[PDB]
Design a protein around this ligand. Structure first.
Ligand code: ADP
Ligand code: ADP
Ligand code: ADP
Ligand code: MG
Ligand code: MG
Ligand code: MG
Lengths: 538, 548, 541
């Protein structure tokens, strides 16, 4: 009846619309099916502009490649938002939504109504939350165990890269999150850790630095490159040509006044420079061994760079806005806007300050701090896409480790959480559950859809997913009567099971809780949609 | 039956998106796509290598045999080829040496990988085979090193370093090109032996000036920088000697103007009569303090007004125009001067020293001579390059830069660490990795043994480009390495290498007399980049392209 | 999200195929599509009905109110309309009467089902509702017949059958058109004391020859046939010969030749002199035996050569071509002769008798008159129409064809009897179907009640086409049946219709019982098919 409302319109409903959500989610999951797992495939994206994106992250595949199917747009926006808050779960939600639609599609063909199927998803998901309390293992932060943070960080590293880059980046991420933990217990992920792309040597040479690194360096040659003891002065005021306010200007009566009025431009610049000189007069003690540096947020007039050169003062201009907030954490001083009020207390402290000039760009390195409150991670790579591959690998590992210190609990990985829900939902009495009759069927579709992820891990290893899970179910049968509580994982190397606690495979708590909650709402709204149409004024 | 289903549910992505996976022979097509541009750089390898012509969209022609330079102007399509293209560019930036080796070695690792994949080796086991074999390769390079450069500067020792590097790029005459580069290096070295200071070198210090006409034998080395400029007021040979005092001003010479609304204000005719003579006394008072200091030359960084050029011709002061920045920055390093923005009297301690400034006709235009002399040495010397064609002038400039980059390799490491040349470095690694492949049990020995087979391209390429049969010459070279080591020490068989033309039959005796060697610091990064370039291609199971 | 998935079934079948299935459309949608053509037939129903002009791609214009004729020349893309079109075609071929009733009744059965489907009643139980209601309708039509007549002979008995049919089509003429058909039927029927065993009757016994010009009142009835031809060789002898023997020859008149192609073979010139007089005396021998038998008229279907026409002109023997074979057997029934393909000589038993033959111009063109008075004719007649326009006489011929079709439907079975007209029968069927639903409880009561509602369209169409209110005259008609005199109440078309009651026996407007039985069975089955088709499959172009 839509052809009578609009002259030209396209619509698909009932069985036509039922094949929309099932088939479109099947093709999207197949792209990320080979992605899941540390042995998963590696994809490269090349656009028409010539850029190259090489990563195993499923979020880059969704953002770079456009999707014409509206069904996957709902999944792409759900998989993207999962990586935003939890830093993980992009490819997990896609495998959950795509499979749960197919597992529930078989009963839709049998005549079961979609609503009573989606009603069983909420009943089965609320049990995963009650089971999550007994499934999680508590970890006390008072022990300050470094080995625990090493095994958790390797979960995301072994997936994106191999063991070569994992062994290098494992202590780097651990040393980065070590300074994040404080007596205040507050964890701030953005200011504590950054990703700076620089092409030097090989990607495997990436090293950790305990102090802030900047993209700027001294423009004047006489500026000291290496300063033993430098006092960092934070200046957010810029010395340079101003907007001048509509450009009123000067009017000189005689040629002697023309040059007399030209000296007024340096009157305002030298006015703020005398305050810096007066501040240097307090720290003048041990001047040859010590030093004084200036870091400005905005560009500095090259006319005034010669003033800092005679005093051997390193000047840095056009610095980032976020870098100004971290100068108090690295050096330990305070920020100063107006130069009228200056004190030695706001001055920072650094044990080593040096600059390494590579090519046309110059970088400034700061390290050796008494009590540094923040650190950095210097990302080195061979190629442009190599800088992005490490950027996506380290950043995804940041939220994984940071979420561990937020709560007191940790979730074991290796498919131990998905297999445990299968035996729990199938063996649970339905009288305890609020679902009865045909709603009992919808719960079985949710439990069977969770077993594909541990089978998807095996598909990348070449082993038969059906035969490798036969030994997992047989181990959990005798474990209940033997008075032994042990979690059974999946080892893809030998094609047998394993223990995630002994092997060191752990997963974040916030990732799986938001993934199942997010994937359930997507698949439920798609099963409840019986018609898909397109209309609008263009 | 008439029309295919045409891949149902393909509307998930745009029609321009294509999916290519390791299955269906696309990983073989990717390796076959490398061989298209691989054979292009094979004929360019070695001293007998052939240069290539590449015409861009703007019409500029760059004739060079360097793999890193040729791949810049070429438009690449296949994604995995860009992995090989960007791998050769990093080798040219970092070490400035061994660019053709990264292109050839990374391409041969994929050629031998085609047989490895056909036998059923997974992509994971192939990567682990090259990583374990490369770690053993880097350890054997330090064991096979012979000799050292020792002292920084020597007349003879610089002929064992820059000369074998520039022999592959525009071979021509040997001693002619080696003396021009080796002379400019000795000037930029601080020397100062026994002082214990940290050595320093700049790759951008030596500048090559391209001047058409003449011949290569007429080229020379100039201690100062050479520009094409026409003096404004007058030309002066400055035969009165006693050197000179020179000052450099990065700011232009003119009356200081207000940055906002510069305007002449005259209230009455009394101020108008003295306005014309007022500006003349300003430049006179400012330029008088410079002439009183004995400054015969002034370097300007921007346009200078005519009123300022008048008083400069009164005292006989030369005028130089230095546009942009980098051109003026290297001028002060020659004379040892410190620029200052003001027009006042410069500081006597910041004044430079240049004995003579000459203007003569070289390529038909007036050039200014900043050349220094024995005393009061200068840095950032320039090399005048004469040639009949401009195309040869471009690659020789890059050939000299390859020799300048070789000097940088004498600073950061502990020494030069010379390696046997003529392909003897990659050949000795074949017998060592072969023994290493047997010492490792398991299925990983297949990728390790084939990793040493990829090193056979260096002797085969040098023999093929020399007009010799690779079937007769190559097996005859293994006869020296098949006898291993005798019951006595002092074995010189490690100096055997591949010969170009001549009498063939191996030859050149021991390369120790030929003096051609290789750099160890170059071979370290040349193998690492070439291995990661082929590893990246083999680590990608699926390739996706857009719009095409 | 810009482009749709296009569905996986798009690759299945072809893009030219279109699908209309349950919940996919149709379901009182397609029923609303036929309402455009249904309203076309509603305005053409009754004596006040409106004719419709239809221009075929060939350019011929057919102006008639007959639904079977209108839907035949119209090209209709909608397939389910053809179910109703082919339903009206059966009514014209077999019975020939009631084509407008089938299209209107079947169209309303789909309209009353709009409320049934909207209430959730499945189409399976709807079919069973109309089938059980159709069986009860046919059983109640026998008790309402007061017009049973055993005569079927006298001319005044046809005023209750042929005349009511003519009243609807070309209502401007009543006694003029009824006299033309009633007199033609009296001629084709044999004269006998008692004729039993269902004497044979066909639609070919009465014919219509349309002549341009002249008023319709000037028309008359001719026992013979009127064809447009050119006589040759002589003027007729009028009544001087009285009854003359007419010989109808199938083969042309000429010297008999073989089917294969022959030619003349002359060896010597002696046979050349006898070749001229040979063909003259050869055909003259066969033409001489015809004149000896007293045959004044010879009809040869094929072309007659000049050599045969030469001899027949001097003896005064008429020659008529009659090119068409269909009209050749019609002249044989006038004289009562036997068509003879052989030439030979005419036998007395195989020759017919014609009283007189004349050539006159009715409309300005010369035609031959076969009219035979005092003679014996069997199942032959004609009706000469006079009109100013050709299109107006087209529907008049169809009105005559529908008038003689009622005689065929009356004579062939045991009888057609009579039924009260002018909305008298349709209202009585409403009270029968309504009370029938309350006798048997069940879910079929919804389909039975709506089955009686569709009967309200016929009596109100007479009031609607008369410029009357269906909310006054029609409701007052049901109160007139409250209670013989209550079965004769009907719809009145006149300025005196304000009372809404006119006796049917006054004007004697009756309908055939066998016509209504055949019209309901076709209309019910036609509406049953539309509701029994769940999915529609189309094709490209
Ligand atoms: N080396 C491994 N061995 C076994 N299981 C692993 C291994 N690495 C990752 N996994 C499993 O793969 C799942 C997905 O991990 P990851 O790729 O980090 O998240 P996502 O797939 O959401 O990007 C985890 O639940 C984890 O249990
Ligand atoms: N005259 C010669 N005889 C034998 N071998 C030579 C001769 N000249 C150069 N070679 C060898 O050929 C190789 C060419 O190196 P190449 O790939 O051209 O370096 P680059 O790319 O940095 O110019 C050198 O390693 C050198 O050992
Ligand atoms: N003069 C008249 N007065 C009242 N009713 C009439 C008159 N003429 C015709 N009718 C009615 O109009 C109806 C027309 O029906 P018609 O279309 O002829 O039926 P069918 O389709 O069987 O030929 C008849 O039933 C008849 O009763
Ligand atoms: Mg992850
Ligand atoms: Mg070289
Ligand atoms: Mg009629």
């Amino acid at each position: 009846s839509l052809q009578l409302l609009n002259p030209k319109a396209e619509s698909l409903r009932r069985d036509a619309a039922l094949k929309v959500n099932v088939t479109s989610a099947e093709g999207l999951q197949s792209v990320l099916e080979t992605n899941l797992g540390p042995k998963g495939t590696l994809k490269m994206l090349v656009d028409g502009a010539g850029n190259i994106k090489l990563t195993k992250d499923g979020k880059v595949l969704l953002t770079e490649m456009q999707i014409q199917s509206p069904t996957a747009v709902l999944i792409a926006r759900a998989a993207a938002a999962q990586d935003e808050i939890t830093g993980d779960g992009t490819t997990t939600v896609v495998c959950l939504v795509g499979e749960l639609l197919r597992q529930a599609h078989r009963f839709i063909q049998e005549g079961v109504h979609p609503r009573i199927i989606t009603d069983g998803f909420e009943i089965a998901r609320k049990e995963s939350m009650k089971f999550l309390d007994e499934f999680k293992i508590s970890k006390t932060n008072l022990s300050n165990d470094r080995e625990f943070l090493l095994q958790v960080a390797r979960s995301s590293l072994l997936t994106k890269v191999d063991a070569d880059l994992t062994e290098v980046l494992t202590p780097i991420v651990t040393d980065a999150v070590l300074s994040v933990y404080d007596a205040q217990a507050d964890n701030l992920d953005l200011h504590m850790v950054e990703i700076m792309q620089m092409q030097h040597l090989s990607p495997k040479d990436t090293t950790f630095i305990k102090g802030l690194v900047l993209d700027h360096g001294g423009r004047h040659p006489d500026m000291p490159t290496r300063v033993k003891n430098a006092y960092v002065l934070i200046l957010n005021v810029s010395l340079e040509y101003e907007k001048t306010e509509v450009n009123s200007g000067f009017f000189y009566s005689s040629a002697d006044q023309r040059d007399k009025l030209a000296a007024s431009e340096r009157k305002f610049v030298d006015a703020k420079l005398k305050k810096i000189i007066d501040l240097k007069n307090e720290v003048c003690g041990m001047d040859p061994d010590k030093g004084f540096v200036i870091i400005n947020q905005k560009g500095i007039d090259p006319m005034s760079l010669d003033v800092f050169a005679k005093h051997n003062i390193l000047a840095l201009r056009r610095a980032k806005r976020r870098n100004m907030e971290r100068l108090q954490l690295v050096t330990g001083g305070e920020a100063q806007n107006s130069v009228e009020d200056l004190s030695p207390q706001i001055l920072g402290f650094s044990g080593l300050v040096y600059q390494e000039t590579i090519g046309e760009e110059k970088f400034t390195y700061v390290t050796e701090n008494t009590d540094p409150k923040s650190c950095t991670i210097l990302i080195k790579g061979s190629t442009h896409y190599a800088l992005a591959q490490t950027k996506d690998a380290v950043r995804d590992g940041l939220r994984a480790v940071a979420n561990v210190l937020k709560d007191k609990n940790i979730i074991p990985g290796a498919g131990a959480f998905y297999i445990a829900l299968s035996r729990y939902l199938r063996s649970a009495n339905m009288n305890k559950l609020g679902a009865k009759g045909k709603t009992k069927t919808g719960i079985e579709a949710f439990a069977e859809a969770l077993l594909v992820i541990p089978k998807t891990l095996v598909k990348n290893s070449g082993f038969d997913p059906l035969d490798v899970l036969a030994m997992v179910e047989d181990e959990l049968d005798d474990a209940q009567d033997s008075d032994e509580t042990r979690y059974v994982g999946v080892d893809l190397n030998i094609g047998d099971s394993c223990d995630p606690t002994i092997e060191g495979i752990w997963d974040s708590y916030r990732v799986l809780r938001n993934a199942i909650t997010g994937a359930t709402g997507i698949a439920s709204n798609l099963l409840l949609c019986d018609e898909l149409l397109r209309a609008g004024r263009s | 039956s008439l029309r295919l289903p045409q891949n149902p549910n393909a509307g998930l992505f745009k029609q321009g998106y294509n999916s290519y996976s390791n299955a269906d022979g696309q990983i073989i097509k990717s390796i076959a796509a490398i061989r298209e541009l691989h054979q292009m750089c094979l004929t360019s390898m070695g001293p007998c290598g052939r240069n290539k012509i590449i015409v861009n969209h703007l019409g500029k022609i760059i004739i060079t045999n360097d793999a890193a330079t040729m791949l810049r102007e070429l438009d690449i399509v296949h994604p995995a080829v860009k992995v090989l293209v960007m791998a050769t560019e990093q080798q040219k930036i970092d070490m400035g040496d061994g660019t053709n080796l990264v292109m050839i070695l990374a391409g041969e690792l994929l050629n031998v990988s085609e047989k490895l994949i056909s036998m059923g080796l997974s992509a994971v086991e192939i990567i682990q085979g090259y990583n374990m074999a490369r770690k053993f390769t880097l350890k054997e390079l330090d064991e096979m090193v012979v000799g050292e450069i020792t002292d920084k500067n020597d007349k003879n020792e610089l002929l064992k370093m820059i000369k074998p590097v520039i022999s592959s790029k525009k071979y021509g005459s040997e001693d002619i090109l080696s003396e021009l580069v080796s002379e400019a290096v000795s000037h930029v070295l601080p020397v100062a032996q026994q002082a214990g200071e940290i050595p320093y070198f700049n790759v951008d210090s030596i500048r090559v000036v391209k001047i058409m006409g003449g011949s290569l034998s007429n080229s020379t080395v100039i201690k100062g920088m050479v520009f094409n400029r026409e003096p404004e007021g007058h030309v002066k040979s400055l035969s009165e000697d006693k050197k000179h005092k020179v000052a450099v001003f990065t700011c232009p010479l003119d009356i200081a103007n207000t940055e906002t609304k510069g305007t002449v204000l005259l209230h009455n005719a009394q101020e108008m009569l003295d306005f014309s003579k007022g500006e003349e006394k300003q430049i006179d008072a400012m330029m008088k303090e410079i002439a009183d200091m004995g400054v015969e030359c002034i370097v300007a960084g921007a346009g200078v007004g005519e009123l300022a050029l008048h008083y400069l011709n009164r005292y006989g002061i030369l005028v130089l125009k230095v546009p942009s920045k980098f051109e003026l920055r290297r001028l002060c390093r020659v004379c040892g001067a410190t620029p200052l923005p003001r027009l006042g009297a410069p500081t006597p301690e910041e004044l430079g020293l240049v004995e003579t400034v000459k203007t003569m006709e070289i390529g038909g235009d007036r050039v200014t001579v900043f050349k220094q002399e024995q005393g009061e040495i200068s840095r950032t010397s320039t090399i005048i390059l004469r040639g009949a064609t401009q195309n040869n002038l471009d690659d020789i400039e890059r050939a000299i830069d390859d020799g300048v980059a070789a000097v940088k390799g004498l600073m950061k490491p502990s020494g030069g660490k010379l390696l046997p040349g003529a392909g003897a470095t990659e050949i000795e690694l074949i017998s060592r990795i072969t023994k290493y492949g047997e010492r490792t049990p398991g299925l990983l020995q297949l990728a390790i043994k084939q990793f040493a087979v990829a090193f056979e391209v260096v002797p085969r390429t040098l023999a093929e480009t020399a007009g010799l049969d690779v079937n007769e010459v190559l097996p005859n070279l293994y006869a020296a390495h098949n006898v291993t080591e005798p019951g006595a020490v002092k074995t010189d068989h490690l100096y055997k290498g591949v010969d170009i033309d001549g009498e063939s039959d191996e030859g050149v005796k021991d390369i120790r007399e030929e003096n051609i060697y290789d750099m160890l610091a170059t071979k370290k990064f040349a193998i690492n980049v070439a291995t990661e370039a082929a590893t990246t291609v083999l680590s990608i199971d699926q390739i996706i392209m857009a719009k095409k």
